[PDB]
Amino acid sequence: LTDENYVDIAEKAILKLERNTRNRKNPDAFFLTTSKLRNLLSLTSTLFDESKVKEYDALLDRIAYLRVQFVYQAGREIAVKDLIEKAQILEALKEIKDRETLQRFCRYMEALVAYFKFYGGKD
Amino acid sequence: TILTDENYVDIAEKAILKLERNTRNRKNPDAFFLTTSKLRNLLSLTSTLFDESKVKEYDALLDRIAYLRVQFVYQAGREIAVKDLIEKAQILEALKEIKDRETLQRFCRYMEALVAYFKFYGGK
Amino acid sequence: TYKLYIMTFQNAHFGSGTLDSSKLTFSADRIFSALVLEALKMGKLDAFLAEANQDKFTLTDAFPFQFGPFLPKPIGYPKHDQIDQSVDVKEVRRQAKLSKKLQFLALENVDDYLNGELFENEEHAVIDTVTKNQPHKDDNLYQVATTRFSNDTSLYVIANESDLLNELMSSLQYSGLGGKRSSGFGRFELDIQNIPLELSDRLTKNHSDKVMSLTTALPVDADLEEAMEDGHYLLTKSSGFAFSHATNENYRKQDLYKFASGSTFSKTFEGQIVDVRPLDFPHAVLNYAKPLFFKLE
Amino acid sequence: MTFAKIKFSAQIRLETGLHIGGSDAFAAIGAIDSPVIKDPITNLPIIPGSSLKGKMRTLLAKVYNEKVAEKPSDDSDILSRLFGNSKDKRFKMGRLIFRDAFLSNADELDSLGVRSYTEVKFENTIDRITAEANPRQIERAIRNSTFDFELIYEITDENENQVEEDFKVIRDGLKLLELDYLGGSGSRGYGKVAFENLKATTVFGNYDVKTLNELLTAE
Amino acid sequence: MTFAKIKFSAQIRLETGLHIGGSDAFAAIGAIDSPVIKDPITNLPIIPGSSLKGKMRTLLAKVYNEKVAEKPSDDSDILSRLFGNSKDKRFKMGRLIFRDAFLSNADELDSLGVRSYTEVKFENTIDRITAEANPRQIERAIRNSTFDFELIYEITDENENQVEEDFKVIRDGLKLLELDYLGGSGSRGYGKVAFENLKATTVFGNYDVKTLNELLTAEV
Amino acid sequence: MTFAKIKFSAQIRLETGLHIGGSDAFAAIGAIDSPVIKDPITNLPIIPGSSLKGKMRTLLAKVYNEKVAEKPSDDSDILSRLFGNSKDKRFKMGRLIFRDAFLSNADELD
Amino acid sequence: GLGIKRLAVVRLDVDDLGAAFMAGFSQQGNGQYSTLSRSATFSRSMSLFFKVYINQFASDKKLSIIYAGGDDVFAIGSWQDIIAFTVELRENFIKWTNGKLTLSAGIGLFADKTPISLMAHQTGELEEAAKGNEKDSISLFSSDYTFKFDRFITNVYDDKLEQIRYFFNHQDERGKNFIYKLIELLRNHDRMNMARLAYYLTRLEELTRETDRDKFKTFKNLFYSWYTNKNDKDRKEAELALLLYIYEIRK
After folding, report:
1. Is-contact G113 C141, C-beta < 8 A?
2. Among residues B85, B83, B43, which one has the least CA distance to residue A114?
3. For chain B, which residues make up each domain, given as ranges?
4. Residue B105: helix, strand or coil by DSSP?
5. Cα angle G80, G81, G87; round to 5
6. Angstrom distance (rounded) from CA G237 to CA C61
7. Cα separation of E16 and F101, whole Å?
8. Is the bond leading into C74 cis (omega within 30 degrees of zero)?
9. Rounded distance, CA D185 to CA D187, Å?
10. What residue in E sits closest to D135 (Cα-Cα)?
């Protein structure tokens, strides 16, 4: 799937990400803004923070809520839906069986965001 | 290839010399865009990595070398002088080349060297 | 006259009269004393003293052994006709002092040394005192000087191999030598090794031309006058307290002056094992002083 | 019974930082205030045999002396037989030969990327009335340093009963070192020590070590 | 009356961040921090026994002296008996041996996903006239860290009743540490500490601990 | 009065939102806000004792000094007595120990 | 209550004195100036210097001259005064001799109550190390610290040590601690430790008061100069002056 060599995957996704090529300085010119993501990142991090002293079996409500806001926000803005595609996030979510898998996904989000900001994303 | 036992410090020094300086300051000499405060949380992680390279074995710390890379790009994303540093000093490449406790410890020391010569040649 | 008994120590203390003194090497009497003392607890004293009074029996001062054996600087040499170059005075006197400073040649170099070629010392060890304390007063605070061996330097001795001697030396290597042995010093690892022809060729106990003594030795009253007249020697003083279980009290054994290795004489003499016991002591106290020699040219 | 020499060997592990301390002018050099005793050629910390012997003896006096003794000549025959007694014809030398212990794992540490084999420990003192602090630096040999340990026991005039008792005394001695410290600032957490891979070996004569080895591995 | 050695063991849990530290010129080349004392091989925080002993002693002087002592030489026979007195022939060697405490739960923390064993606490000061703020970073060993604790007590020449008194003093000492801090910026919330799993064990000689174990599980 | 220790305990309830401390170390990757001081292990907010002591002291100086009090060294003996004064031999060690306060009611809120 | 509690010994010797007595007058002319009378007068010069004038060099210094002659001078005292005595004696000797003759000396440093035999012996060894250079040297406290007299005087004693003294007499405990780091780094000279040297040097510069900030800038870069020279002479002198300083302040 993704695990343990996922930074390379996260990057490989992000360089593929959608570009507003119209801009006079449109380098890669990501269409996306950290502003658009914010809520679901605070959610993902609260999930990681929470899985440490709670159990994979009993968390899954919050993982529904995460998928939900993923889709909702995917609707509300185009560049988010694009991100979720090119980084196969929605495929990844359904794939989480262990607490090991879950923590891997949280890390994955972290990685995506890091490489977004690196490559000229606007926060 | 990039980081050799003979190599690292001389490279680190060269990098700190080639680093982006604020020429727009009439008052200041070669004065660095970069500032220790920007690096602090980053090289704290480097040091925790080196410190643990002694008490644990290479595979056990793969998670740590993951989170290092991330933080590096993240900070290079958030600060211009950081991106400049990790550019001129080939940092991310240098991580890619770490297969080994020998190589790893060398990288940690590399950061140490960079920072030393940063402060030496005008610092935060 | 048979084998090189090579003791290799890390820590040793060979006191030259004080606990805050220490030496590179020890002499025949010390290890003979030590051998005697080991035989005595093994049971086998009587048998060892048997062996020791054999003309065949051979013991020598210890010497530096560094990838091969060393020897003592021949006292008396080089003579005047081999030592007087045309160089200025400052040089002659520097190399004269360099020649006095010298202790031990490697075998390879001894003939050179005699023929006039210059050599200086090598670092075989470092000696330092350390202070130790006893935590019951400021009245016990003392320094013990140790010889700390460096540069793959062992000590060796030439001895005539026998089943008994071999056994006693193997046991000694867990008893230590000289030293505060109880307290950490002196232990060694033994290697008995064939003696290079280049050396064994030049060993005698009887010979009527010039020889250097390899043992700190005292001639028999009958040979003494001769060895002193045509001799070149340094007299060393053997002194100390006799070690023994005989009595609680400690008595100085009798001071004995001997000729140092290698003093040089015009010919070999017969030597003694001296009884240096305190007058009217329960048992003999033995100072081994019987020379093995090395010939010159 | 016949003459024999048994070698007690172990690796001393430093469980906490150890300070014995420099007298040798080489090792006395004031580049730090309170230096540690070091082997002059390697400049590594060294555990002097005199330290081990001394400490183990004074520990064992608390157990095995019927009457507490002012001077070491007044120690019990059971201690005197092992450590030696200068004023008693029978025991002028004990049956034990200690050896200076040297740093074994220098190479292990060099490989791990350790730099110095000594830490400099900062401490201070608080005036009880003025609360002002007077600070203090003192060297320790780093913890998890290991030292090759060797002690020789000589069997001479002992009855097998006697060598057994001697072995009891030696095992008590080592345990007592483990439940105490090797001379340092011990009260304040310094000299803790462990004997690892503790083993007896007959290096001369015949003695049988099987039951001793068992008894050492269990205490 | 006989000879015996009792080992007091516990796990010290840090209730708040702890700061001992203080090698400034031997510090990590890293960044500004007031560094904390660390075991050189593992670079982990350490609780030096010197610290435990010192603090516990000066706490206990407030209880057990019943006349203020200018110097630690002037402490009561009960304290000198335990902690040692260099200027009294009787107590030159104290019955207690404190031990450097080391981080036990590194594995617990690695499981909980911690990325360092020390936090940097950011603080500031406000000028009381100018209202200007001067900031300050200072290192602490992280909060839910635990350390193996070991203290050795030696019975020689003491009335079994003297052993009783000594035990009282030890328990008072530990409780006083719990109701105080381990030297740090203590007044500002540092160095709160707890003794968990506190138990005595006779590791040499023979002594009966059952009653003591009861009593020190009671008083912590 | 022979030695004794009195422990003042309470629960601090936040009547409004509270914001104290923190830095770009404790930060979440893509946090855009000014973060808060947190316990590193649980990543929960913590109320640092340094903060409580600070605020309480500077407020109390306005009441109890009846003096300018340019620096905390210059506070009155009654405040120095309690919070401690680095430059006075008598008060070098203070009678109050504030403690980092930790979140109780996580379960109530959940 | 300042200064290390040690007492010192000095042993010092004229260099190639034998050579002077016998042929020092042979160079000029061609040996026409080598007479008996000339040599006699030489002997008187050295008697005078070593048996009369020596006492004056000792005056007002806490020390005792036990043996004194062109052959051998032995003096024991408090340490700072012994080093002062050695230096005063030598520079008088160079002037007296018009530069044509030198001394070597070595200076032992010991704790109270070490026995006489020991000090004499260990200080004799130190002196021979000193004669171990091209014979114009002085060895202080360890064979490793062995310098041509000329550059110990000029460079260690009254340059590097005066600079060090000046900066650190201003610094507090926290800065004075850095001396230990500097020492260490001097003993472990390697490429990377040049980096570390620079780091703690600028760290010190940071902790130094603004009055000395300019002078200390100059000094800091000078130090790193010594430490970077491929020639090791300046950093040796550095190690020894930092030592002198630490001994000088210790309580």
Report:
1. yes
2. B83
3. 1-124
4. helix
5. 95
6. 43
7. 9
8. no
9. 6
10. E22
CA D158 vs CA C246, D167, D170: distances in Å = 18, 12, 15
Under DSSP, the state recorded for B2 is -
Candidates D9, D2, D11; CA nearest to D204 is D2
Among residues E36, E59, E72, E39, the alpha carbon closest in space to that of E184 is found at: E36
Q: Which residue, C236, C198, C196, is CA-closest to C216?
A: C236
What amino acid occupies position D130? T
User: What are the tokens at D181?
Assistant: 């410290």
Q: Return d(Cα G46, Cα G36) in angstroms, integer.
A: 16
- The residues facing D8 across adjacent strands are D151, D200
Closest to G14 measured CA to CA, from G59, G54, G41: G54
> What is the extent of the structural domain holding G96?
1-157
**Long-range CB contacts (< 8 A, 24+ apart) of G129-133?**
G130/G104, G130/G105, G130/G106, G131/G13, G131/G15, G131/G104, G133/G104
CATH classification at residue G118: 3.30.70.270
In the three-class reduction of DSSP (H, G, I as helix; E, B as strand; rest coil), residue A105 is classed as helix
Helix axes D160-178 and D210-217, enclosed angle (nearest 10): 20
Q: Check if the beta carbon of residue G61 is closer than 8 Å to that of residue G81.
A: yes
Q: Is F12 exposed, middle or buried (0-12, 13-18, 19+ CB in 10 A)?
A: exposed
For G106, the 3-state DSSP assignment is strand
CA distances from F106 to A50, A60, C55 (A): 11, 19, 98
Could you tell me if F93 lies within 8 Å of chain D, comparing CB atoms? yes
Q: With an 8 Å Cβ cutoff, are E100 and D16 in contact?
A: yes
Nearest to G106 by CA among G79, G88, G85, G129: G129
Resolution of this model in Å is 2.9
> Is C20 in contact with G18 (Cβ distance < 8 A)?
no
End-to-end CA gap in chain B: 31
> Structural domain tally of chain E?
1
Range of the domain at D82: 1-219
Which has the closest alpha carbon to D147: C184, E102, F48, C74? C184
In whole angstroms, what is the distance from residue D117 CA to residue D37 CA?
12
User: Hey, is C185 helix, strand or coil?
Assistant: coil
Residues 6+ apart with CB under 8 A from C104: C63, C64, C70, C71, C72, C73, C121, C124
The angle at the Cα of G58, spanning G55 to G64, to the nearest 5 degrees, equals 90
Q: Which amino acid is at D38?
A: K
Query: If you search the block for the tokens 């056994």, which residue do you land on?
Result: C167
Contact C182 D3 (CB under 8 A): no
Asked if the C-beta of D159 comes within 8 angstroms of chain F's C-beta atoms, the answer is no
Residue of D nearest to B53 (CA): D112
Beta-bridge partners for E123: E136
B120/G201 touch (CB, cutoff 8 Å), yes or no: yes
Chains that touch E (3 or more CB pairs under 8 A): A, B, D, F, G
Q: Pick from B74, B78, B91 the residue to mutate for testing the A interface (most A CBs within 10 Å).
A: B74
Task: Please name the residue ranges forming H helices in chain G.
Answer: 17-23, 36-48, 54-58, 79-97, 116-132, 149-151, 161-168, 173-176, 178-187, 191-207, 213-228, 233-249
Phi, psi values for residue B72, rounded to 5°? -55, -60
